[PDB]
Amino acid sequence: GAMNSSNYAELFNNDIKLFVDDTNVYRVTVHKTFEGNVATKAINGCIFTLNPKTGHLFLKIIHTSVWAGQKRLSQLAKWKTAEEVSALVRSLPKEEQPKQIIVTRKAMLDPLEVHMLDFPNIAIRPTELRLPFSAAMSIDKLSDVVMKATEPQMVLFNIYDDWLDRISSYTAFSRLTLLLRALKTNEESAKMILLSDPTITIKSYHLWPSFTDEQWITIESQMRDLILTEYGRKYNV
Amino acid sequence: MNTVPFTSAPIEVTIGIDQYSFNVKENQPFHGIKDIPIGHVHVIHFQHADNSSMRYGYWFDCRMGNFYIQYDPKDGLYKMMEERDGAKFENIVHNFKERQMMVSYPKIDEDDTWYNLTEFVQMDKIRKIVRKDENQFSYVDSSMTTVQENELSDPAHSLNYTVINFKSREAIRPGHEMEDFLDKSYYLNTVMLQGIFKNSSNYFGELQFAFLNAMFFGNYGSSLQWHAMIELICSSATVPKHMLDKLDEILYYQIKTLPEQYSDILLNERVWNICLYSSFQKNSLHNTEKIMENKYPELL
Numbered sequence: 001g002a003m004n005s006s007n008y009a010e011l012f013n014n015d016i017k018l019f020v021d022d023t024n025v026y027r028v029t030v031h032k033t034f035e036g037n038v039a040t041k042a043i044n045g046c047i048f049t050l051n052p053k054t055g056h057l058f059l060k061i062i063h064t065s066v067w068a069g070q071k072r073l074s075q076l077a078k079w080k081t082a083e084e085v086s087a088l089v090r091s092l093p094k095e096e097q098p099k100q101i102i103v104t105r106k107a108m109l110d111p112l113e114v115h116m117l118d119f120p121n122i123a124i125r126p127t128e129l130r131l132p133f134s135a136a137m138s139i140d141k142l143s144d145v146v147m148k149a150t151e152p153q154m155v156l157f158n159i160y161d162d163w164l165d166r167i168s169s170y171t172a173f174s175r176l177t178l179l180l181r182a183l184k185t186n187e188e189s190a191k192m193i194l195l196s197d198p199t200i201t202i203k204s205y206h207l208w209p210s211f212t213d214e215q216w217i218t219i220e221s222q223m224r225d226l227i228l229t230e231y232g233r234k235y236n237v
Numbered sequence: 238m239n240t241v242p243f244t245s246a247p248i249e250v251t252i253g254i255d256q257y258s259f260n261v262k263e264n265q266p267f268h269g270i271k272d273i274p275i276g277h278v279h280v281i282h283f284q285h286a287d288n289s290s291m292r293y294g295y296w297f298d299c300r301m302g303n304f305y306i307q308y309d310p311k312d313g314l315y316k317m318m319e320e321r322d323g324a325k326f327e328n329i330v331h332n333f334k335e336r337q338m339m340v341s342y343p344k345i346d347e348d349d350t351w352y353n354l355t356e357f358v359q360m361d362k363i364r365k366i367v368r369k370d371e372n373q374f375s376y377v378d379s380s381m382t383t384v385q386e387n388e389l390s391d392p393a394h395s396l397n398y399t400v401i402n403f404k405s406r407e408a409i410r411p412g413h414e415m416e417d418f419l420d421k422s423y424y425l426n427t428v429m430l431q432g433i434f435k436n437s438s439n440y441f442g443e444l445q446f447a448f449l450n451a452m453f454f455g456n457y458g459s460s461l462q463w464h465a466m467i468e469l470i471c472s473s474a475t476v477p478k479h480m481l482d483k484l485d486e487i488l489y490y491q492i493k494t495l496p497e498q499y500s501d502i503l504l505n506e507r508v509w510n511i512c513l514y515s516s517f518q519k520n521s522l523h524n525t526e527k528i529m530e531n532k533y534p535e536l537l
């Protein structure tokens with residue numbers, strides 16, 4: 001069933017699983033029309049499909065053409081997500097297919113369950129965790145590939161860079177959630193923390209800067225401070 | 238007028254005959270029920286005074302044989318049996334009638350309730366849902382499970398209702414996942430109506446039979462089946478107009494007949510609110526919506 005604080009280490013066992021987040025699939029800018037009405041303009045989006053044990057990110061870019069002439073786009077987006085996740089699973093060799101798929105929003109359960117009826121042994125699960133995967137579009141290289149797409153495209157990334165050479169996947173996931181939570185709570189400040197020091201660079205094949213172990217500890221402390229702050233700046237505490 | 242005689246009434250029991258019920262005391266001089274409507278299936282049912290647990294009963298059609306009730310002190314229940322000796326049976330019934338030892342099924346100037354609840358119910362279809370081919374009548378009780386409940390345990394004693402499952406490959410065409418899940422017309426019209434039931438009369442017959450087993454026996458799996466069959470229609474955007482009009486009449490009389498005090502356990506809040514207020518057919522069940530809103534506004 002649901003995934004929460006009590007079964008957190010299950011994410012890092014040796015049963016293949018994927019998180020699926022659909023919060024950036026259907027993206028719009030809201031604007032005024034010449035007549036003073038309001039309309040939306042879709043921009044490119046993405047499905048965020050992540051193996052939390054390995055860091056493998058299957059980023060399916062959703063080009064705005066998939067919405068042309070369609071109605072009820074927020075509903076369609078859930079079914080398009082489920083369609084693309086199902087297509088991904090079917091494209092993987094059997095021994096790479098997930099045993100569980102965890103959706104970050106409960107509204108994806110029925111769309112994904114229906115699309116995965118051919119896979120009765122893959123468990124579709126919700127979670128009680130509030131995971132900050134919407135902030136994926138605050139990672140500059142991911143935002144860039146999404147916004148530059150002229151057609152549907154899948155791009156494969158490791159969202160942990162090379163961290164697993166030095167830390168475990170529990171620690172890597174905790175680092176990722178901290179970074180993404182910070183970017184979600186105050187993107188400008190979080191990005192300043194990550195890129196203020198011009199001597200620490202991002203490798204061409206990486207998403208995040210090449211921090212040493214000690215620098216990660218400092219960075220991680222600065223992100224906690226940011227989150228606690230905003231929590232005060234927010235609630236006045 | 239047909240008759241279901243009783244050998245005797247050895248244990249105190251609330252006997253039901255269709256929508257009627259009456260009390261017979263332990264060893265009361267009671268010998269059965271006369272003046273029963275030819276042309277209708279019927280159900281005769283029982284609740285012992287000492288064990289209100291296990292309501293049970295028999296679906297039957299007097300045109301198919303001469304049936305009587307006899308208590309079995311070993312199995313502890315009133316059993317329906319068929320008498321093959323036609324003259325013996327007629328003679329027995331005539332004696333009991335002459336001595337005025339039978340209650341009478343009432344036939345009331347205004348009444349069409351039982352017709353309206355069983356319009357599409359056929360004994361032959363009942364006997365396929367309830368499998369016991371050596372008898373012409375069908376036993377049902379409170380505890381019998383449905384084939385679908387067993388998939389999710391004695392098969393001989395099951396209710397073989399048609400399995401309806403909205404998240405099933407049968408319900409969902411590959412490549413039409415969203416379409417078929419949000420508009421169930423292809424599952425209703427092609428899979429179920431054209432494919433399994435053959436026509437809407439057979440579909441309504443099973444729907445009405447499921448309701449009556451839910452109401453008279455408190456059979457939970459029957460209640461589930463009734464609601465699933467309602468929901469499959471209401472969730473289809475394309476339904477023949479005659480089916481919607483008939484469904485409205487069917488449900489009207491079921492809601493009218495339901496005991497007011499059983500509404501909390503026999504009516505599923507989600508299905509009814511979805512069907513009357515959210516579904517494609519939200520505006521197509523005027524009679525049902527009106528009686529529901531006036532009789533059970535709390536459910537809604």
Ligand SMILES: CCCC(C)(C)NC(=O)c1cc[nH]n1
Nearest residue numbers: 259260261267337338339340
């Ligand atoms: C003495 C003849 C009238 C009978 C006795 C047949 N009425 C009943 O048995 C009866 C029992 C409960 N309701 N009606």
